[PDB]
């Protein structure tokens, strides 16, 4: 088996996002995907009708079945659904500090439909921020996590909250053709790029395969520049 | 969006089988996968610890969110978990007789671990057999569905039970290097082939794209001869 990325992600039946997108991205990165499903959502391209969040017990049962069997090198999270599941993931990560971890701070669906109570989820994410090898917020997620509207100030706030590295997707350098991404490591700009961007799972795959953070981010852009 | 295959399949956290394999195969066929998850299983490469079957209500809710939004052309089923879910799928298919349907009669995991009570599931599958465009049993599944050990006789029994077409995977022509597949249409041998075989979802994708059954089966073998 290839190095494995274990994904704590929700299921989108329409196949536009969620663990399906994780599987597609990780396969294309060259790694193997394993899945601990956090929720069965009821949604399509237009709206979210609702979701059934996985219990913390069933979430950890899925994850722990993978541990010891597959060569897990990295964890990726997307939709977690509940504060219980955020806490369960933190528990899992603290039991395995040797795993890398890519935090994609999903708060809402592509359609804008609810994937949980944002106020309580934002507060719960505080626990996961310092555990991540990389956090990948878009500009909306960045502001929600920090309560700061200025992008520069919000980025610094994330580092004050314990972030190790942050890939901010979008911002003042965007155009009709590209979203500009900025990679910060320990509060400093490390790479400033673009992307013709769901990058978390691909990056996780490259990290599992032994890439440096900068090399993983670059590969993910190259992948999309061919996608 | 590409033509869509809607998959009624279970989740295997280790990523060796289940809806993950459906997503990979359907993407490579050129179609789009949508998912109605029938169960969250707890398993790895070595064993099945257990599973939590999706309720018939949540199963249909996932499926119906996809209907009307995506261009569904084909349904594929794998693990269904419960007799309730087999009945729910039959209900769904009879509401949409225009969908093609590939029945992969999953009864047990790759490891040999239980995915439900085989005696009651075999009896429940009677309902789905006549609805399928194609059934894809391996030799074990073929014998279990029919209660017949002779492969030729079991195949004819499946047609007496209302089958329209059957792709039997494996048999007396197998070797250490290849499993031989036989495609029967209306009780007659239509194509006799080999395969260097989880073919159901790839075939479903090709059917969604407008291929004939024989052409879809051939494409699926060509795919593996490069995999």
Detailed description of the structure:
The structure is a homodimer of 227-residue chains. With 227 residues, chain A is α/β, with parallel strands linked by helices. Chain A has a single domain, classed as Ribokinase (UDP-N-acetylmuramoyl-L-alanine:D-glutamate ligase, 3-Layer(aba) Sandwich), CATH 3.40.1190. Chain A is 36% helix and 26% strand. Chain A is built from 8 helices and 9 strands. In chain A, the strands form 2 sheets. A 6-stranded mixed beta sheet of chain A has the order 3-2-1-4-5-6, with helices on both faces. A 3-stranded antiparallel beta sheet of chain A has the order 7-8-9, with helices on both faces. In chain A, strand 1 (4-11), helix 1 and strand 2 (32-43) form a beta-alpha-beta unit. The longest helix of chain A has 13 residues, at 83-95. The two termini of chain A are 25 Å apart. Chains A and B meet through helix 1, strand 2 and helix 2 of A and helix 1, strand 2 and helix 2 of B. The PDB classes it as transferase.
Question: In this structure, how is the largest beta sheet of chain A organized?
Answer: 6 strands, mixed
- Distance from first to last alpha carbon of chain A: 25 Å
- Given helix and strand content, the structural type of chain A is alpha/beta
Number of helices of chain A: 8
Q: Roughly what fraction of the amino acids of chain A lie in strands?
A: 25-35%
Reading off the top of the CATH hierarchy, the class of chain A is best stated as: Alpha Beta
Question: Which strand order do you get reading across the main beta sheet of chain A?
Answer: 3-2-1-4-5-6
> Could you tell me the radius of gyration of chain A in angstroms?
16 Å
């Amino acid at each position: 088996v290839r190095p494995t990325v274990l994904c704590f992600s929700g299921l989108d039946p329409s196949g536009g996002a969620g663990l399906q997108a994780d599987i597609e991205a990780i396969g294309q990165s060259g790694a193997h995907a394993a899945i601990a499903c956090t929720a069965l959502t009821i949604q399509n391209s237009q709206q979210v009708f609702g979701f059934e969040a996985t219990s913390k017990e069933l979430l950890l049962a899925q994850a722990n079945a993978v541990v010891g069997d597959l060569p897990i090198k990295c964890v990726k999270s997307g939709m977690l659904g509940t504060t219980d599941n955020i806490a369960a993931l933190a528990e899992f990560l603290r039991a395995h500090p040797d795993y890398q971890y890519v935090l994609d701070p999903v708060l809402v669906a592509n359609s804008g439909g609810s994937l949980g109570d944002q106020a309580t989820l934002v507060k719960a994410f505080v626990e996961l921020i310092p555990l991540a090898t990389l956090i990948t917020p878009n500009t909306v997620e960045l502001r929600a996590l920090t309560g700061v509207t200025d992008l520069d100030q919000a980025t610094q706030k994330l580092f004050e909250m314990g972030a190790k590295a942050v890939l901010v997707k979008g911002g003042h350098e965007d155009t009709p053709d590209f979203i500009k991404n900025s990679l910060y490591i320990d509060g400093e700009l490390a790479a400033s790029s673009t992307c013709p961007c769901s990058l978390a799972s691909f990056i996780a795959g490259r990290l599992a395969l032994g890439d440096s953070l900068k090399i993983a981010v670059q590969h993910a852009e190259t992948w999309l520049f061919g996608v």
